[PDB]
Amino acid sequence: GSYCDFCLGGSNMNKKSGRPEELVSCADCGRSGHPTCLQFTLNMTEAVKTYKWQCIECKSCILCGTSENDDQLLFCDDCDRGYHMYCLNPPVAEPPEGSWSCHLCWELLKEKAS
């Protein structure tokens, strides 16, 4: 019986929308989070359910599995991964102008084929 760190409604009712939604969870804590409250998308939402999404401050740069220079550590908008902008295949250098995406979604974009 947990709740999301944003509205703190629960995995059956969202106190930010008023809709029932399963709560996500962190790996270092286990804190829940509504993919909607989290600003996720069906992709991020699903992704977090696939692995250990972790709760932001735990969301280490999957690339380094550290989070050290988190000052750059972006958060994918298709899975919610963690990438220090200078770890990315095409290093960001500075927070993307628009929507940023990690390699997982892309790898998924190709592998999705037969």
């Binding site: 600003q39 932001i56 401050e57 969301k59 989070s67 988190d70 000052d71 750059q72 550590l73 972006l74 958060f75 908008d77 963690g82 902008m85 960001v92 927070p95 993307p96 102008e97 929507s99 940023w100």
Partner: peptide, 20 residues
């Protein structure tokens, strides 16, 4: 994109700063 720092890892509300 929101980085793990000042971006508060959350969509804020825009910022007055036209890209050079």
């Amino acid at each position: 994109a929101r980085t793990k720092q000042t971006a508060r890892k959350s969509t804020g509300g825009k910022a007055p700063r036209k890209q050079l």
